[PDB]
Design a protein around this ligand. Sequence first.
Ligand SMILES: Nc1ncnc2c1ncn2[C@@H]1O[C@H](COP(=O)(O)OP(=O)(O)O)[C@@H](O)[C@H]1O
Ligand SMILES: Nc1ncnc2c1ncn2[C@@H]1O[C@H](COP(=O)(O)OP(=O)(O)O)[C@@H](O)[C@H]1O
Ligand SMILES: Nc1ncnc2c1ncn2[C@@H]1O[C@H](COP(=O)(O)OP(=O)(O)O)[C@@H](O)[C@H]1O
Ligand SMILES: Nc1ncnc2c1ncn2[C@@H]1O[C@H](COP(=O)(O)OP(=O)(O)O)[C@@H](O)[C@H]1O
Ligand SMILES: [Mg+2]
Ligand SMILES: [Mg+2]
Lengths: 445, 433, 76, 96, 438, 432
Amino acid sequence: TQRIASHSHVKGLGLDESGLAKQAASGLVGQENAREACGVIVELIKSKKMAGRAVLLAGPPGTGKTALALAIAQELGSKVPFCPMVGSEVYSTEIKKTEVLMENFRRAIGLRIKETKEVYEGEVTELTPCETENPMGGYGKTISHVIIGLKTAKGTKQLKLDPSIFESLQKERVEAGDVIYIEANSGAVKRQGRCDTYATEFDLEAEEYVPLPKGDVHKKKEIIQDVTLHDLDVANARPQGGQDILSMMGQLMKPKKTEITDKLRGEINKVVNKYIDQGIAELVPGVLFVDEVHMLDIECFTYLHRALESSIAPIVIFASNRGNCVIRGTEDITSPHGIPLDLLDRVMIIRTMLYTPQEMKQIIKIRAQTEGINISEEALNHLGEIGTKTTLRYSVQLLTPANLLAKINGKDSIEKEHVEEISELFYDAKSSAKILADQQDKYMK
Amino acid sequence: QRIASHSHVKGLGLDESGLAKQAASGLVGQENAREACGVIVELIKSKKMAGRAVLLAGPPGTGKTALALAIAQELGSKVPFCPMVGSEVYSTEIKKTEVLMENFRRAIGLRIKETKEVYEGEVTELTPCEISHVIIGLKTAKGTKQLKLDPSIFESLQKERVEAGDVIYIEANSGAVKRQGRCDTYATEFDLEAEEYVPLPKGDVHKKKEIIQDVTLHDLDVANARPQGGQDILSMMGQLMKPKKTEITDKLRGEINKVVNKYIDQGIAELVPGVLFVDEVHMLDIECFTYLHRALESSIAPIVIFASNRGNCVIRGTEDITSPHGIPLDLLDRVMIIRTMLYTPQEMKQIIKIRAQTEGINISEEALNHLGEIGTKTTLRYSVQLLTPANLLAKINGKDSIEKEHVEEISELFYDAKSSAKILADQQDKYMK
Amino acid sequence: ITPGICFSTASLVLRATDVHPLQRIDMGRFDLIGLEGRVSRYEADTFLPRHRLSRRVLLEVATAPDPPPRPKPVKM
Amino acid sequence: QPVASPIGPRSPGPSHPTFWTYTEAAHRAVLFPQQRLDQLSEIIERFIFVMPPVEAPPPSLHACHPPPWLAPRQAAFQEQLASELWPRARPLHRIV
Amino acid sequence: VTRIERIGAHSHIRGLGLDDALEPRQASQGMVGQLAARRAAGVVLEMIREGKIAGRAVLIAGQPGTGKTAIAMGMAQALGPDTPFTAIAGSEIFSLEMSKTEALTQAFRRSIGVRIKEETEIIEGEVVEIQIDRPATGTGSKVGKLTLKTTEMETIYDLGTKMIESLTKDKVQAGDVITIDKATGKISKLGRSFTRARDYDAMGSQTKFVQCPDGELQKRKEVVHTVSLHEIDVINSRTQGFLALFSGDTGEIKSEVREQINAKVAEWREEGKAEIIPGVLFIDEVHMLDIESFSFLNRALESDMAPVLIMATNRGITRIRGTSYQSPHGIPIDLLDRLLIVSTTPYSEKDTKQILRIRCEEEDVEMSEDAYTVLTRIGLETSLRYAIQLITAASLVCRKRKGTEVQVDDIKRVYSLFLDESRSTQYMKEYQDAFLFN
Amino acid sequence: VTRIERIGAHSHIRGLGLDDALEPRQASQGMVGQLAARRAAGVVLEMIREGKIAGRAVLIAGQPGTGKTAIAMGMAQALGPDTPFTAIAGSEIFSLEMSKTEALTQAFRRSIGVRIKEETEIIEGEVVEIQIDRSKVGKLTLKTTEMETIYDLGTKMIESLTKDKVQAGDVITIDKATGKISKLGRSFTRARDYDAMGSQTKFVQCPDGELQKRKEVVHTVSLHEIDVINSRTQGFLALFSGDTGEIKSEVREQINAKVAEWREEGKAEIIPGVLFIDEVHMLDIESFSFLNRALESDMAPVLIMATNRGITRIRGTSYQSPHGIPIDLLDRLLIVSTTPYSEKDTKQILRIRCEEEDVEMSEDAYTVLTRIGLETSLRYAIQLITAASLVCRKRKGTEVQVDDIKRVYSLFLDESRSTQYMKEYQDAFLFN
Ligand SMILES: Nc1ncnc2c1ncn2[C@@H]1O[C@H](COP(=O)(O)OP(=O)(O)O)[C@@H](O)[C@H]1O
Ligand SMILES: Nc1ncnc2c1ncn2[C@@H]1O[C@H](COP(=O)(O)OP(=O)(O)O)[C@@H](O)[C@H]1O
Ligand SMILES: Nc1ncnc2c1ncn2[C@@H]1O[C@H](COP(=O)(O)OP(=O)(O)O)[C@@H](O)[C@H]1O
Ligand SMILES: Nc1ncnc2c1ncn2[C@@H]1O[C@H](COP(=O)(O)OP(=O)(O)O)[C@@H](O)[C@H]1O
Ligand SMILES: [Mg+2]
Ligand SMILES: [Mg+2]
């Protein structure tokens, strides 16, 4: 968080309340049409009524595609799931590519569970059965309640409980002076140790003595837990916590991703629907961002048709900087973005354009502000001129070396000389390619 | 019972002299091929030759698989018949040669006499004897007997929750203890017990039964390579940690051969050499063919029937080596080739009528002639596959028989391969790739 | 149910990997993975450098007489 | 131990922040293998019937004069493994 | 609140929309046009429902966006949940855990259901009073008594030890409506007829009550158990197979196990114990299968346990995967001879407009007639899916400007914002050097 | 004596040889020439030391023998051992156990060090008596050289003491918070003169001071190590075996959050480091695509790369790119170019190598060797240094002369002469 990454300045899409894109806002400069389209996509995600919709961000490299996706993620917030992914990740040594894609799809669909946990805390002061003056059957003693006195920091309360709790109390070996908690939703007694006020400095027990509970005896709170469908799938496919031989084998054996079946996923879907109907949970459909989609092969592209045609799928955002490239897994088949036309027919294409020198200068200034770097006007103009040739990434990557060089020279700002020296020290792609071409005999291969 | 593609094939339709009747046992033509298959059936029944390979060669739709299943029907259910497709050797667990060898051993069967020792009765006493043995008392309608059993049997009884009064079945050979229920005599004691009651056994406490077991060499190999008969912790551990198939060694197969020869010498086993059928042999690669050379040269191998519809085609696994059936000439030198021929329109009509009778469909003569004409173009398979949709159409319109109009309607609704090819050629710019 | 396979081999084969202790070195001086879950950083870094025995202390303890018996507890 | 799961670790009590983080609804959506067995009891009773055609004990290694320590060591290893693991294999009794 | 299932591509398709004579209506149950293809799908559906012919294969072939998957989904919705319907993509059979033939076999056997129907004795009533007497110390025989009540009956039951243990484990109290199966002794609580005593604490909020059951106490009810062939294979393959039913990780199931299961299911069918419910396997984009998978399909369709196979492909004369051979639909001619091909014709203007109207109705989007005309023109010029996406895009744009009906201006706005394949390719040609490769 | 570290190809490099202004000296810390490249490396090293910016990539490009790996080793040496420096080759990401992206993720998380700091109260003493009444309640007596006290035990403490078989004379430590007991050793008495000892028993002195002590442990671990620890129940074993597999992304996110929590609490500190991939051209296009977006994380180290390829073919594709690297990644990185060395630089490098190997050479020998190095290659001359030293020692000489260099030049061939001799007898060799 404290370290500054490549998209650390993107705080969202700089959109007016009417959806029109401001020239410079929220860390984004230019790309007004793409930003407006991404705002429409954000509204689509927030509507939560569409499944399987796909958006392809198409444009030359270094045009804000990843920045736009991260701005969308910022607009949605942390509540909405956002699963970034590169196309190379489908190639796994454990599971098939379609399984990786399906798992990321289920990772993008989140579920928020709200529950109220009501507990009774306290140190047991009293443990008294409530006998009945008329014993049932004539002989012996019959009890109708068990009075348990619970003491906390700021109160003391007595609880008339069901007689059946006497067995739980004996099983937990609960005596006076012990700290216990009873859960209303289950009616069970759990002994969380003995009070620390009865411990002496000469005792050696570690987990036996506990502090007297703070707050009120009756504690109730609303628990909000955010989970994804993939979390439930994984927890059910390779369960952890059993005491049978299969759980022991799972613990012993090396963990391995498996091809989760449609049966388990259908069961998870049924459970999620049941929770939603009960009011416990609320579905939070999020976004799956697949950067470098062109790295997917023909099998992944073919599977994506069925994946997007599903009624449970999230909204998928693709990104590709390729031109009329050859689809991977095929022999000499060319498609406009490296993506077969069948999948391009299922996506909405958002075009990102190149940046004018003024927009490049603005982006450089924003990056300098983010990195805590003071740059003079002449140095900024020179660096923007450097960015007119070479690329924008080279210019934004010369900021920190130049700042270090200035600090070594003893100056608190980057001057033009520092940028010139850094440009001399570090080469861009085009200059290096020129050097390689001029000396192709001396290099290898 | 559902009607499959070869449900009408009941035999080779041969006479007593071995000659092929024209239409018999669901077969219409291929008289030379049927006579050759009868010779092959007699060879299999001889149980003298080993590793004799036969190739069924001909265009698709000429009844090669029908002839193989007819050979199976002639042989009977006792003789093993393992059908495998050439695409099945490409497993992700074991090597292709291991798959081929396992399918070779699956074809050899063994009928072995076995005696089962059974302890069956109501438990009257379950006294542990200190590792703690068990002394058990069993009663039937004929008597009572007391037995001393191994601690493993006591553990099994505990796992079955066997208590005094329960009817149990013990197999002494496998040590398998089954609790069948609480005895019927105690079914009146309670009104809700959550128990299943069983009558008292009416035989003796100790019984010996002799039965005939049908097993294959592959079953013995698997049982001796992934053992689960010890009922010890190590067997469970091996089963749970190593569930995948393994490449069984030649040493294990030699030991199994020795054991089976010993059983046959003892007179309690009978060998049934059996048949292996590989349908899409062209889907094997050159390594599989090279292995099959030596495998067929073995004196243990079964009779293998191969099939292929390929012409002069490139052998899989090779770059550009082309062989007459997709099979290298070395393996073709080791096979007897049975040639299947294309069917005449009359034979097509006969096959259509047989399929209609098999599927319980009444078809008029005009409809039969029209469907045979449809089969003259396109293929016989398409004409046969139009019978059920036409029957459904006739049933919808209230007719109990197929008329020519129903056949015309079905042919209009469903295209064949040639019509679809024409459509693709006419609209190549609109379809993908 | 079949009897198991009895695989018979030479008795000398089962001793092929066996090496007499007088012919092999102690590999426990290179046992790094055996220390995990048993040896702590405290033992290696702070305690042992301070509380390693010396030959002088060992000889003094060995030569010295037995320590006097521990006095019985007295409620005082 | 349950890292990155809807199931929370064993919180000592409400004093621990983990007590108020996880829900019982999430817990009930994850089924242990024992719960799965209880869920498929009728299916197990009705549909599990396939028996191996042959059953054999594992191959045994025999030498005339084996090292007298190998067999007792294997016996002790098997005994300890059985004493630790056989109680955990009881749920699979009906399947076996 | 939004359920796990939302508006998808084929959410408007509720069935094939045919009449009794399998004559397709122009617009019914979401389907518009494709009359011949829908009639063929209805005939295939009748063949599936009859369930008498094994291993029938149908190929739905046509241009992209002609309704192949729409027809498949309509068939699936018309079949109903009773009949199995396994829909997979061609890419899904390429697995590192199992062979391609094994994956195809599992797909086939997930499409056949085995149903076991049996009658059991069932006790359903309201618990009036339960008494359980147990020894104070040491092992002993628990003795108990249970009283159950209906609207017309009330019986007092003497309980055995195991039923006592079951009741103790289930924590059955007075007022709980419980179900007891006499054979297995399983007890299932299905509600409370009334509340517990109010004077008790730490009890929680009492839920709603359940009316007491009527009729006799011990009834006889029919219990139906339905599993697929694949589930039987998995649970019989190994001891841990039931977990493999959810985790996958089945490996390759032995052919011996499958042969035994086939024999046993045939025996059950002959003995009247079980009925076989054949279903459908739908392989979308079957052109991704290689030659080995097709060769396996050739002979796997010849079994009597094979389901109806439905394939969809939009390929013309194309190279078969794994080979260098050009074939129609990317499928070898040997497999093409075993299957009937159903062609889908392209949609007209009125069919496109009706599809757009159905989509708008599904998405709860109100659109003007001029907007419908413009959107239909765009769909004819570009594609149907682009217009479908612009439906929702224009709905969102209209809602942003506090509107109620999607106008031509909103459609133009989303047409400018979002590009089709053609305009994107044009703009990429305009800046070809800026893009990386070619 | 001969230690495990011996004279290698970069044993003479101790640093980048820069001053306080990052101006490279002509010959300092074992580096000669490459002034611009060394200055760029120093700037990158200052960037690494600051640690503010994440995911910075630098490519050291140049002709073979121009000092790319020399510069990388100089950067590694100049950087302290405190800061992680993971040096891998490009071929090492092709694993049979985990994917290429998983290998690159593991290398990235191996390049970030996490320094932990735990302070714990402990009881430390020698056991005098253990009395247990009946496994219900008991007393334990512990002593130091200056102290002795008795403790009342509970059920779990008694069970833990019985499990560890703690008896009299054992020196143990007990953690107050968790109660875990580890045995340090046992005290030596006259009666404990064992003739045979167990593999774990060792005799230690009775601790001095006070029975209650505070234990402070400071150690540096990487993110990958924490991932492997928390991957499975005994995941620390995979830190030795390497059988890690593909770690779940959820585990990594949880560990990132926990590490951030530790950093906020003051219990841990982050030391971002360097991942050096040498000969990156062996990476496939998928690996480059993964690297493109892996560098964009906030927990990404500095990625230093080195290739000697010209415009060549990218592995896994049919495209030609200036370094074998797709131009999208090349736009994400700064390129440091190395120039070929001059005669003076070659002679100075030969002198440094001779000093490193402790070889005395005459000036005529140095001239001849420099001429050979310019004509054939620098590495050939470097090898001839040791060859001539050995030949000189064989003839009982003390200083390498021109005759020794000529002798080893005739004995050992460079690539050009061997290729010529092969072309002379081309038909003899196989598969031309
Ligand atoms: N319009 C913009 N406004 C502000 N920053 C931008 C803009 N476009 C790109 N950037 C920044 O410049 C860098 C270029 O990367 P990016 O354009 O996201 O790559 P890609 O084009 O592959 O998505 C990113 O770090 C991004 O944060
Ligand atoms: N001579 C025949 N008589 C009756 N039916 C036949 C005959 N030949 C083939 N058939 C039927 O035609 C179909 C094609 O047979 P098949 O053996 O699959 O062809 P091939 O093996 O040559 O590809 C099968 O369903 C079979 O039942
Ligand atoms: N005849 C039709 N009736 C209703 N909706 C249709 C029809 N044809 C296509 N669609 C819809 O158009 C969209 C794309 O059609 P689709 O079936 O995916 O084309 P393809 O046949 O190439 O798979 C789907 O969401 C589908 O619901
Ligand atoms: N500037 C330098 N100073 C000292 N030695 C150098 C220098 N440059 C290269 N060398 C030596 O040359 C040899 C080859 O250079 P190296 O950097 O290892 O490989 P390359 O540069 O070809 O990738 C190394 O043994 C190194 O010691
Ligand atoms: Mg489709
Ligand atoms: Mg190098």
